[PDB]
Symmetry: D2
Subunit: 497 residues, 4 copies
C-alpha cells in the first residue's frame, strides 16, 4: 500500500523529516512513561550512595538492586508500575521488606524533580543536536548562494537587493543566539536536587555529591526547598522552545511567501509538499504550515507553566504544569522538517534577479548616488527619486529601463531644477548586482562580506558540536560508572558474601 | 492633607516602596517618549561617525550637532517631535537643508532597533540593581533568623521543621539564578544593530564599530537583516521578567498565608499594610496582592511579543509588539515593595515554634528513629507512625505530648508487635529544634548549614554588585566620550574653521 | 494488588472521580482518532445527500455505503486509515473505482471543519452535563448548610460572618453564567460547513440543508470561505473552558486554605486525599492541586489557538492549532473530582463558629450599630471600632469578650468623648449568628435569603437539564434518520435493483 | 507645520482612522481616571437610594449631593482625589462629618466592581458601534464587487475563482458572530453588584433594585460574594476583544499579501499607507501592520486576567488584573483603521482576472467536467488533470491556453486511454467567470448567491443598529432619572426645608 497522499503534484514519497510532522502526536510518551527510566536510574544511584554511606549494607544493597532490574522488566509492559509507590510495592512483592529501605532519606518530591530534570536534560541535548543540524543546513545552503541576487523585504514590500546567501546568514545568527540560550539553560537544568527529600533534607548522613555525580549532574540544587520547589528551569525550557520556534515560524512564513504562485521565486522540493484532494493544481506548503503550527502550540506550555507558578507558594506543589514529551517532540519534528526544506529548496534565480532589476528596490542606490555626486541632502534626493518611481509606475517603466531623461524630468517637476549626473551614473545605480557589491561592510550582502560571516559561522558550528560532544560524553561516562557500581555490589554479594 | 487611606489599623504612612505600587501606572512614559533621549544620542553618535569617515565635513557635522541640541529642547515640551521624520523636519527648519544629511547610511529601522536596545539596556541595569537589593534584604533577614524555628509547607500542609533563615535562603538561590538569566540577556541586548540601515546595509563607508563604541555597546548585531528583524531579545526580556516575578508572586503568597488570621506566624509591618473602608478589623496585605498583580500582568507582554513574532516573516515589521515602560515600572515597584516587606516582616516566633512542636511535622524524625533504632524498613515504620498520628488526632494529643505508650499501642495495633525504643528516643525525635539540628547537610536547615549558604550568598552578592558597577561604568564612559566628541566638533568649527 | 498509594492517612480507595485525574493523560485519544468516527458519519451523510440529488445512483450509493462499513472496521485497528486519502484508498481497494465518487463536491477542508465541529459538539454536551453535575452538588450541599455559620474572606483575611450555604451559592451563580457561555457557544459550534468544499463551494448541485440535517446540525455556516476558514468557535471553546476552570481553581484553592492545619475549618474526605511517601502525618489535597493543574493547563490551548489565528490570513490553513481531546478530558476529570470534593467535604462547624465569634469579623456590625444608635457618621464609627480592635488585640481579648468598658475607653481614647450605647447593644452586635440574620437582603447570608437563592437555582437547574436533554435528543434523532437512510439504500439495492 | 511623514509616495494626509493608530497610546486614560466619573455617579445613586430607604434624611442627602459636585470639580484637575478614601476625605473637608454617611451599607469592593462594570459597559457599546461600522463598510464594499472576479487562496496558494464580493461576505459572517459574542457579554456585564458591600451584604435596609435601576443596569449580581469576587465578565471582555481582533488581523494580512509588489491585485489608498525614510519606492502597509499589532497585543490582557483568576480564591482580591482603557482604545483604533482600509481599497480588477484565467485555479472545474461528461470517478479525473497542470507548467502554457490536445495527451500519459470530451467543454471549464457562475449554491461566489447574502446581512445590520440604539437609550434614560432625582433633593432642601 503506497502513501495515499502522494498523488498528482505530490510526487515521490514524503521526506522522512516531513513525515515526522505527522507521526509525533500519536507516538508521544506520557511524561510519566518518559521519566520512568530516569527514576529507575535514580533508585540505583540513591541505593549505591546509601551503601557508600553505610546506611545500607552491601547485602541489603545487592538485594534491592537485583530487585530493581526485575521490577523494571515488569514495568516495561505494565504502565501502572511507573509511578513511585506502585513501583516500591512491586519491589516489596519481589524481594521482600528490605525494598522499603531504598526510600531512606528520600521523597517522591526530590525523586520527581531529579527525574524530570534528567528527562529534560536528555531532551535538551536532543534539541541542541537538532538545532545544530538546522544551522548546518542553513550555513551550507548560504555558501552555495553568494551570488544568488534577490530582493529582501520589509513590511512584506520589496526593499533592496541582497543575496539568498545573505538572507540565510541572518537565520544562522538567530540560531547561534538560540544555541546560547539553550546552553545557558542546560547549566541550570543539570543540577541535582536529590537529598532535599521532602523539602528540608534529612537526618540521614547522605552524600549528595555522590548521587549527583552518579547521575551525570554537574552540581547541586543546594537549598532543599529550592530542590523541590524550584521550577523556573521548566518555564525557561518552555520559553527557549517558544522563542526559537518563533524564528522557525518566521522562516517558514518567508519561504511560504517566496513560493506563492505570485512571487514564484522559490519552489519547495516535492518531498516537502503535499497536494489537495479536490484541487489538482495544488502544490501545498504542508511542511511549512505544520511547522508553524508547532511554533504556535509551543506558546501553550509556556503560559501553562508560568500560570501555575504564579498561582502557588514557594513550595513543592502537585499543581505545577509540566513540559511534556509531545511538546518537545513537535519541536524536533518541525526543526527536522525545516532543516530539510532549507536543504532542498529550489530558488528561481532568474525570477529573483528580474524582480531585483525591475521592481524598484534599486532606488536607494539612485538616491545615494545623487547625494554623493551632487551633494544635495538625503531628504531632497529621496523626494526626487520617489517622484521618479511615481512617474515610472504611472508610465509602466520598469526600474532597469529608467534613464537620464526620466530622472531629469522628475528632478525638475519636484524641485524646479535639473540635476547634474550622467546616464552611466544612473545605469550603475540601478544595476541590482552592483547594489549588492556596493554593500560590502560587516553583515552586508556583498559576497566577500557574507563569505566572512560563513567562515565565522563554520568556526562557531565547530564549537557548537564540541560542546554537545562534551556534554553527551559526560552523561555516558556517569551512566557507565553507575552500571559498573551496581554490578560490583550485586556480584560481590552473590559470590563473596 | 494626610494620606486618607491611613486610617484605623493602617497606622503611620505607607512605606515609600509600598507607595510605588500606586504611582507607576499614571507616571509611566510611552515607549516613544522613553526611547526618544536614546534616539537623540544615536543621532549624535551616527553624525560623529560619519565625520570620522569623511562622509560629513566637520563644518556640516558641527551645524547638525548644534541643531540637535536645539531640537532636543523643543521636543522636551512637544511630544510630536519625538518620532524621527517630525524630528528631522524640525532640524531642517532649525539649521536648514544640511539636516537631511544626518540620515545618510541610516534608516528608522536600525535607529529604532538601536534606540529600543539602549532603553531596554538601561532598564535591565535598573532591574538588576533592584533584584540585587531584593536579594540583599532576603540574605540579611536570613542571617537574623538562623534559630527561628518554624514549619515548612508542601501542598499547603505542614511538612517538617526548618528555620525562617533556611526558607529565605531558598529565595536567595532563586534570585541568584534569575540574576544569571538577566546578565545572560544583557549580553544579547547590548549589541549594536546600527549600520544595518533599512535591512541590507549601505554603500556608504560606515564604521559600525565606532557608532557601537560611542553608544556603549559591547559588539555588533552583525548581519543587517538580523539588525532590523531581530527581536528575540525583547521576548527574552519579557520572559525573564515574567519568570522572576512568578518567584516573587510565590513569596508574596507564602507571606500572605503566614499572615492570615488563622496562621498568624507573621505580621506585615503597618507601613506595608492597608485597611478596609468598611471593616475596621482589617489589616490587609495590599502590598502583597498588588505585587502579585504585577507578576500576573507580566504574562501579557511576553505573550503579545511572541505572538507577534510567530505572525510575521524574518523581516523588519511594524507589527511587532514591544516591551513597554509601564511593564518594567510595575516590576520595579513590586520588587521594591517586596524588598521592604521582607526587610520589615515581623515573625511570631513563639507561634512558629508552637506549630512545629504540636502539629506533627516532627513525625518523619520519629519514623527515621524507628528505622535507625530497630532496623525495620521505612515503609513499615511509616505505617506505624501514620497510625500514631491518626490516633493522636482522634484523642486530641499534640505531637509534643506523644509518648512511649501511644507509640507502642500504634505499633501493636498496626503490626501485632510492639517496638523496642525508649521514651527518651521518642522525646528526642519529636523535639522540633532537634529536627532542625539533625538536618545538617548541604542546603538543610541546621544553623551551621544555613550559615554556610549565607556566606556563599554574600560572596555572590559581592560579584553581583561588581558586575553591575562594571556594566554601568562602561556606559558612563561611552556617554562621556560621545559628549566630548560632540563639543570638540562644535567648538573647533566655531572658532578655528 | 491494592492501590499502593492508599497507605497511612490515605484510607480506603480513591474516589472514582479522584482517580480520573490520574488516568486521562494516558487514556486520551489523538484528535485524529477522536474525530474519525464523525468523519465516517459525514461520508454516509454526504453520499446519501448526493443520492437524493441524483449525483449518485442508488446502485453507486449502496456500493459505497457498504464499503464504508468495511473500511470502518479496518480502521478500528489500523490508525493509518483514519485520515481521508488513506481511507478513500482503502475504500477503492475494497469496492473499486466508484469509491472515488464519494468525494464529489467535497474537500478535506470542509470535511475536517465539520468533523471537528461534531467532535467538539459532542464534547460540549459532555462538558455541560458535567458542569450541571457540579452545580447540582454545590446547590445540594448549600441546602444542608443554611445555618452553618462561618467567616467569609477578602484578601485572605477574615471579613464578616456568612454561612457555608451562602458561600456555595456564589459558586452556583458562577456556574449558571458559565452554563450560559457554553450554551451560547453551542449555537455557533452546531452549524454545518459542508458544501463549502475547498473554500468556494462547487458546481455540483448539492443540498447543503440535507447534509446538515442528517448530521444533527441546526443550521449552516453559510459563506463557503467562512466554512473552511472559520475557527473562532474553537478559540471560544478553549476560552470558556479556561474561564470556567479558573472558577474551579478558585474554589479548589479556597477549600485548600480551609483545610490547612492552621485553618482547620474543613477536612477533605479521605477518598479525595492522598498522603506522603516520607511524611506520615500528611493528608494531602492532591485532588485539589491536580484540579488546579488542569485549570492552569487550559490556558495553553487558548493561547495556542489564538496565536495561530493571529498568524494567518482568512483562509483555510493547516497551521491552525486545535482544541485536543486530552485538554477536554482534563476539564472533565477536574470537574468530576471537584463535584465529589464538594459533595463529601467535612466542615468543622464548631471551629467555623469559633472563628466567627472570636477573630473580629463582627466589627462591621459593631460599627453599624454605633451609626444607627448614636447617629455618628460611618468614618468616625469605623475609627472608634478600629481602635477597639487594636486594643483588644493588644490585651488578648477575643471579639466575643469585648464589652461596654472596652468600647467606651476606645471611644474616649479616639475622640475624647464616650458613646451612648448599652452592653446589650454591643453583645448583640458581636453575636456572629445575629450578624448573619441581620444580613437578609437579596444575595445575603441570612437563611431565608440563601433559601430563596437555592429555590431559584433548583428551577434553573431544571432548565439546564431540559436544554441538555433536548440538544442530546436532537442529535440522537438525526443519527437514527441517517442510519435508517443508509440501510434503505443498501437493502433496496441488494434485493430490488 | 505639515505632517512630516507624508513625503514621497505617502501623498496627502493620513486618513483620520489611520492617525488614530498613532495617538491612542499617549492619549489613553488610566483605569482609575476612566472609572472615576462612574464612581461619582454611583455615589449619587447610592445616596439617593439611601434617601428613599429613610437611611439618610433629605437634609443629609442634599448636603452630600451638593458636596459631590464640588469634589467632582476638584478631582477634575487633581488625580489624587479619584480613588475612594481620598475623595471621601475631600468631601468631609467640603461639607463636614455627614460626608461619612454616604458609605453606609457600602464598600470600596462593590463600588469598584460596579464602577468598572459601568466603564466596561460603556466601552462595550463603543466597541459594538465600531464593529457595526466595520461590518457596514465590508458589506457596502461587497455590493460593489459582485462581478469582480479573483482567486481565493488556501494555504497561501491559489485555489479557485471567486469574487471580491464573495470574499468580503465571509468577513461579514465573521463579524455577525462576533457581534453576538459582544451582545451576549453585555448581558453579563450589565448586572449591578452594589449592595454586596464588602462581600456579605449589610444589615442596613438597602433597596438594591433602585440603585441598579438608577445606574442603568438590567439586573443584579445577586449573591454578595459573586458581587465582589466575580470577574469572569472581565476575562470574557478581554477574550471577545482578542478573538474579534484575530479576525481583523487575518483580513489585514490578507490585504497585505494582495498588495505586495508580487501579487499586485490590490493597492491601499494613499491615505492608509506610509513610506520609508530611506527607500523612496516604498508604499508601506503601516495601517495594516499597526492593526495587526493591536490584535497581537490583545492577547496580553486576556492572559493576565485569567492568570490572576487562576491564582486566587473565590474572594474579593486586589491581585486581579484589569482590562485597561489603552487596550480597548487600541481595538477601536484598529477597527476604525480597517474600516477605512476596506472602504477605500483599490482592487486591480484586470490583474485579478488575469490570475484567475492563467494560474490554474480553474482546474477543479475541468476535473468536475470530466466526471460529469464521461463518468469517471473523481480520484482518476483528479490525477489526469494534475498531469495536465504538470505538463502545462513544464511547457509554459497558461491555464486559459490549455486545449483539447493537451488534455488528451495527459489522459493517455496518465491512464493509457484518451477521454471523450470536446474543445468547447474544456474551454467552458477553464473560463474563470463561468467557474464563478457554476458555483451558485448558498454561500457560494455566484453573483445571485452573494447578493442573497448581502440582503440578509443588510437586514441583520438593521437589527445590530436597533439593539445598539435600545441599549444606549436605556442608559441615557437612567442617567437622566438620576440627575433629576439629585436636583429634586437638593432644590427641595434648599427652598422648602
Ligand atoms: Na554565541
Ligand atoms: Na550564579
Ligand atoms: Na442564566
Ligand atoms: Na447572529
Amino acid at each position: 500500500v503506497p502513501d495515499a497522499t502522494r498523488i498528482g503534484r505530490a510526487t515521490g514519497a514524503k521526506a522522512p523529516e516531513f513525515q515526522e510532522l505527522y507521526d509525533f502526536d500519536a507516538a508521544a510518551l506520557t511524561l510519566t512513561s518518559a521519566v520512568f527510566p530516569y527514576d529507575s536510574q535514580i533508585h540505583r544511584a540513591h541505593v549505591v550512595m546509601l551503601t557508600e554511606q553505610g546506611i545500607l549494607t552491601v547485602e541489603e544493597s545487592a538485594t534491592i538492586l537485583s530487585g530493581l532490574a526485575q521490577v523494571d522488566e515488569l514495568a516495561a509492559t505494565d504502565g501502572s508500575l511507573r509511578t513511585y509507590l506502585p513501583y516500591e510495592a512491586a519491589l516489596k512483592r519481589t524481594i521482600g521488606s528490605v525494598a522499603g529501605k531504598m526510600h531512606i532519606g528520600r521523597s517522591r518530591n526530590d525523586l520527581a524533580n531529579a527525574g524530570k530534570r534528567m528527562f529534560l536534560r536528555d531532551q535538551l541535548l536532543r534539541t541542541i543536536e537538532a538545532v545544530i543540524g538546522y544551522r548546518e543546513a542553513v550555513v551550507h545552503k548560504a555558501a552555495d548562494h553568494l551570488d544568488t541576487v534577490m530582493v529582501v523585504y520589509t513590511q512584506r514590500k520589496e526593499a533592496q537587493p541582497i543575496t539568498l546567501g545573505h538572507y540565510l546568514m541572518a537565520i544562522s545568527e538567530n540560531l547561534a543566539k538560540n544555541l546560547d540560550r539553550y546552553r545557558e539553560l542546560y547549566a541550570r537544568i543539570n543540577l541535582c536536587p536529590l537529598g532535599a527529600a521532602a523539602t528540608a533534607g534529612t537526618g540521614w548522613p547522605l552524600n549528595r555529591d555522590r548521587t549527583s555525580a552518579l547521575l551525570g549532574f554537574d552540581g547541586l540544587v543546594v537549598n532543599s526547598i529550592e530542590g523541590v520547589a524550584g521550577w523556573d528551569h521548566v518555564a525557561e525550557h518552555a520559553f527557549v522552545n517558544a522563542v526559537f520556534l518563533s524564528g522557525l515560524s518566521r522562516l517558514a512564513s518567508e519561504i511560504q511567501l517566496w513560493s506563492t504562485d505570485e512571487y514564484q521565486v522559490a519552489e519547495l522540493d516535492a518531498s516537502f509538499a503535499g497536494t489537495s484532494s479536490i484541487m489538482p493544481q495544488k502544490k501545498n506548503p504542508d511542511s511549512l504550515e505544520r511547522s508553524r503550527k508547532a511554533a504556535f502550540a509551543a506558546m501553550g506550555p509556556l503560559v501553562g507553566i508560568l500560570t501555575s507558578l504564579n498561582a502557588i507558594e514557594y513550595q513543592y506543589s502537585a499543581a505545577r504544569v509540566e513540559l511534556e514529551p509531545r511538546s518537545i517532540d513537535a519541536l524536533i519534528a518541525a526543526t527536522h522538517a525545516m532543516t530539510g526544506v532549507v536543504r532542498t529548496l529550489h530558488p528561481n534565480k532568474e525570477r529573483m534577479r528580474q524582480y531585483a532589476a525591475e521592481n524598484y528596490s534599486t532606488m536607494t542606490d539612485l538616491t545615494d548616488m545623487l547625494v554623493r555626486r551632487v551633494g544635495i541632502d538625503y531628504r531632497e534626493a529621496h523626494e526626487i527619486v520617489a517622484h521618479v518611481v511615481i512617474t515610472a509606475i504611472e508610465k509602466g517603466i520598469k526600474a532597469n529601463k529608467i534613464g537620464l531623461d526620466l530622472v531629469q524630468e522628475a528632478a525638475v517637476a519636484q524641485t524646479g531644477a535639473g540635476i547634474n549626473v550622467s546616464a552611466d551614473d544612473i545605469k550603475d545605480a540601478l544595476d541590482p548586482w552592483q547594489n549588492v557589491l556596493r554593500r560590502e561592510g560587516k553583515g552586508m550582502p556583498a559576497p566577500m562580506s557574507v563569505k566572512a560571516s560563513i567562515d565565522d559561522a563554520m568556526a562557531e558550528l565547530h564549537k557548537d558540536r564540541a560542546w554537545l560532544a562534551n556534554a553527551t560524553q559526560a552523561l555516558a561516562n556517569a551512566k557507565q560508572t553507575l552500571a559498573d557500581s551496581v554490578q560490583q555490589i550485586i556480584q560481590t554479594d552473590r559470590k563473596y558474601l
